[PDB]
């Protein structure tokens, strides 16, 4: 049926079976996770294997069976035939060494019980990002990418709990992706709350002032839309073209870029690069153009640089 | 709950000919039957001391400060607080009723008898389990199961700060009172003692080595 309430009764049903007790049940799981953390590290010494290799063999045996083959540094390995070689080389390590395993199992499995219980947090974090540029299921899944990415890092040793430690990482992966996948172009990380900030003065001046005043952002209209008397035309149908080849692009920038570096290096690099990269690399400014001189000497050397650069006497 | 089964050894005097001492007698078990009365000499004198019990009473006597007398009274004997040292004149005026005790929480094991005349001085073993509890916080970990003893260095519960964690005392049986809730899982309990297993998660029926 309609998938609005289905993820909800899918979350709120094991979150209703496991609404974590704020101290007993929450801190129990975070310990086991860190229990499994170091037990894997100590198993990496005894066996001579990658730590994240070991955590990943644990994950595969806990979930029963899966095909989720990915490791940093290693992308793949024979999964269903070799994970059991790994599990039996673990059956050989004695009583002293197998308890690290027993703890490593219980720790990563509690990691899932941890997450699966804390997803109603994600439900009410993404609920304040409703009309932002992503569907509500894209938001929760970006929020569930954060609560997972908060489980690698949490330290139960410091007494502040996980309910407030994960709100940051969840609201960090949400604001990660809204700045990415909301409009067609990969928008700056900046312009998000520059566009969002004018939209909250426009609704604090249009509340009263009644005026639309004086003193790189717009929204796409689709290609097919019935124009006219809500007829059969599509809007791409009335677009003729300007030209095919699009010249002075490649042959120009090829001259353009190489003849830049020529004069750019023939005067002092402390001179030419101050503006090469200020006006050309990230932003702009000249209230802080200065790597450490007066706002007056930078304007001095800036202009004087270009002038000997423009014409040499 | 920690039960610190502290031990001591105390004497008593019986009817000589009446068979009133058996080894099949444990805590809460019979001693002696129907001597009408008892008043005989437990020959010592010392400063009066008495310690409480649920069903029982010690009497220790420190003349100066050394424990001159340690004689236990199974209930059914009528004690008097501060009597006796007139001439050490058989103060143990514990009245032999028609019944005897039978110390329910304190166990009566070993036995020793020097036989003479009317009465035998008996020396035995006395272990009374002291119920003393602790309270665990959210950040405290119960490293001990549903019942096992403990050594003088054999830490019981670990917490966040090394500041006052539940370190182990003299040996005690570990019982648990208050859970925060209760799991009822349909499973099969398979205890092991000596050697190592296959870990949590895998499949078994009956599988191999369990």
From Swiss-Prot, chain B:
Domain of life, source organism: Bacteria
Subunit: The RNAP catalytic core consists of 2 alpha, 1 beta, 1 beta' and 1 omega subunit. When a sigma factor is associated with the core the holoenzyme is formed, which can initiate transcription.
Function: DNA-dependent RNA polymerase catalyzes the transcription of DNA into RNA using the four ribonucleoside triphosphates as substrates.
Sequence similarity: Belongs to the RNA polymerase beta' chain family.
This protein's name: DNA-directed RNA polymerase subunit beta'
Taxonomic lineage: Bacteria, Thermotogati, Deinococcota, Deinococci, Thermales
Gene name for this UniProt entry: rpoC
Full-sequence portion shown in this chain: 212 to 421 of 1524
């Amino acid at each position: 049926k309609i998938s609005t309430s289905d993820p909800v009764r899918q979350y709120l049903h094991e979150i209703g079976q496991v609404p974590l007790l704020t101290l007993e049940e929450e801190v129990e799981l975070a310990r086991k996770v860190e229990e499994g953390m170091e037990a894997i590290k100590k198993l990496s010494e005894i066996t001579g294997l990658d730590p994240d290799l070991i955590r990943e063999v644990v994950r595969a045996k806990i979930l029963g069976s899966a095909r989720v083959r990915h490791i940093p540094g290693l992308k793949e390995t024979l999964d269903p035939k070799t994970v059991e070689e790994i599990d039996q080389k673990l059956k050989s390590l004695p009583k002293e060494h197998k308890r690290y395993l027993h703890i490593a199992r219980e720790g990563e499995a509690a990691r899932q019980h941890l997450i699966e219980a804390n997803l109603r947090l994600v439900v009410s974090i993404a609920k304040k990002y409703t009309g932002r540029g992503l569907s509500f299921l894209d938001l929760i899944q970006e929020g569930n990418q954060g609560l997972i990415r908060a489980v690698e890092k949490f330290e139960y040793k410091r007494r502040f709990k996980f309910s407030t430690y994960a709100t940051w990482w969840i609201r960090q992966a949400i604001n990660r992706a809204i700045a990415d996948q909301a409009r067609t172009i990969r928008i700056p990380v900046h312009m998000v709350e520059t566009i969002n900030k004018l939209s909250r003065t426009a609704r604090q001046l249009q509340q009263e002032l009644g005026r639309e005043p004086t003193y790189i952002a717009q929204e796409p209209v689709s290609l097919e839309t019935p124009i006219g008397d809500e007829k059969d035309s599509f809007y791409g149908d009335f677009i003729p073209d300007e030209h095919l080849p699009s010249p002075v692009d490649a042959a120009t920038q090829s001259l353009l870029s190489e003849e830049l570096e020529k004069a750019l290096s023939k005067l002092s690099e402390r001179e030419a690069m101050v503006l090469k990269l200020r006006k050309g690399l990230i932003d702009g400014e000249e209230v802080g153009a200065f790597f450490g001189v007066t706002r007056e000497r930078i304007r001095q050397i800036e202009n004087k640089a270009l002038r000997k650069l423009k014409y040499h006497e | 709950r920690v039960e610190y089964v502290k031990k001591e050894r105390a004497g008593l005097r019986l009817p000589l000919a009446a068979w009133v001492e058996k080894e099949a007698y444990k805590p809460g078990e019979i001693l002696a039957e129907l001597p009408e009365p008892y008043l005989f000499r437990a020959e010592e004198e010392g400063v009066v001391e008495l310690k409480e019990l649920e069903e029982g009473a010690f009497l220790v006597l420190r003349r100066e400060d050394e424990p001159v007398a340690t004689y236990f009274l199974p209930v059914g004997m009528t004690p008097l607080v501060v009597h006796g040292e007139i001439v050490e004149k058989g103060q143990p005026l514990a009245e032999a009723k028609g019944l005897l005790r039978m110390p329910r929480q304190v166990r009566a094991a070993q036995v020793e008898a020097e036989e003479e005349g009317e009465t035998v001085y008996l020396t035995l073993f006395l272990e009374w389990t002291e119920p003393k509890d602790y309270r665990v916080q959210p950040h405290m970990n119960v490293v001990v199961p549903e019942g096992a003893r403990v050594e003088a260095g054999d830490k019981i519960v670990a917490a966040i700060d090394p500041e006052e964690e539940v370190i182990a005392e003299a040996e005690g049986v570990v019982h648990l009172h208050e859970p925060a809730s209760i799991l009822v899982v349909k499973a099969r309990v398979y205890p092991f003692e000596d050697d190592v297993e296959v870990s949590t998660g895998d499949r078994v029926a009956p599988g191999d080595v369990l």
